[PDB]
Amino acid sequence: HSLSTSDI
Amino acid sequence: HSLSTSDI
Amino acid sequence: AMGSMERASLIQKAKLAEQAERYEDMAAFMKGAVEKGEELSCEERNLLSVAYKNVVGGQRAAWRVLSSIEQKSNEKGPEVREYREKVETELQGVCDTVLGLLDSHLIKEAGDAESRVFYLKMKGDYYRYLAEVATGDDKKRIIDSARSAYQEAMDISKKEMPPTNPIRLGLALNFSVFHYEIANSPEEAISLAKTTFDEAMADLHTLSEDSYKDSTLIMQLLRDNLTLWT
Amino acid sequence: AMGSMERASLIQKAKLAEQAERYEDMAAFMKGAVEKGEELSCEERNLLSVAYKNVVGGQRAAWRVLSSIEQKSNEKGPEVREYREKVETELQGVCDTVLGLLDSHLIKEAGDAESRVFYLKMKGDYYRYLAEVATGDDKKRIIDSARSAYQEAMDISKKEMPPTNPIRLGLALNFSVFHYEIANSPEEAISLAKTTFDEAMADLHTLSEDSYKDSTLIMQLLRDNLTLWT
């Protein structure tokens, strides 16, 4: 999936 | 903190 | 989660909520199903149990975290106590809901032994959860209500279930926990756990390859608790 | 509700809620703290962001589970659609609450380029979450709001922040996600990510051990997205 800032 | 059936 | 929804559709959505780890939704869907008046199958009983087990389980974990901070600081500001009181009230409201459904719909004079034990054990557990947070004469009444539920479930399980039956095992386990942590009788708890384990071990060869895992998992918990308690 | 509680107490309870993994409670405490009208410190900004990030995060994960189960229609009953709508409405209500807080209290012309970028990035993120579930003319209207917010945050970051500033990196990270997933522009997404990574990489030798830890953490997320997108 696409990682954002939520993903540490 | 004893183990019960919730911890199986 | 309401009374305008077919019973079968509530079961479907309870399973969806479980997949999405939306256990508050899941409990609400199963509450709506119970309130339809019909009996729950074995699979449906477990959906009910899993749903509320997760909801109350998160509240109990939160209550324990805040209660330790309150006692550690007991040896300051009222923020910890104030918030711990809010979590406590929320936990009690869930336990009351569960106990209400049990008394109102699920605990029947005569069903099959599997189900009669299941609901009476559940009654004992959720009275036990209330006892974890109660304090005064109200606690004495809760404990006695837990004991009677556990004891009646125990009596049925010993008369109608073999010693390796996972539901009988799970009952004895939680009952031993009741003795240790609620009734403050560590000798009864150790005795009950050891006796339950030994009588299961003596029969373990009589189990099929499938049901072997369900019983041994509980037997390992009994053994884990015995290490803790001794 | 929270109006009778001191600002400092609300912050203490938000930290307690975080310890207890009570993120819905944590968001309500921080919402109350913001509504006191006073600016948030860097510490308090992150408490707010962490709280609602966990709340909306669970809803997004649940919406995705249900949406794929719903999309697998012929590769049927209405239960999946109905429950997905319920979750969707709930997700939207949280995003609206965050956007309402940003417009009403947090987004300001005053303040350092750190708070200003932080809140504008947050506005873009939560319009993006809304875009993930919208459909029609309301959707384009939503995407424009996310784009506009990300761009204004982008403009501030590239003017007042070095390339290794973690807040600048995280904004660029999320903006590139916006391009790839919302705007359907993989070329722009890949270009922005690569540009952000390389420009930060070239300045890593000017950093201390602590800054080096913060920057590389986000840069690895840019690396992961790049290797996946190309």
Author numbering:
A (entry chain C), B (entry chain Q): 443 to 450
C (entry chain B), D (entry chain A): -3 to 71, 77 to 231
Report text from the authors:
The data establish that proximal phosphosites spaced ~20–25 residues apart in both hDMX and hDM2 co‐operate to facilitate high‐affinity 14‐3‐3 binding and provide structural insight that can be utilized in future stabilizer/inhibitor discovery efforts.
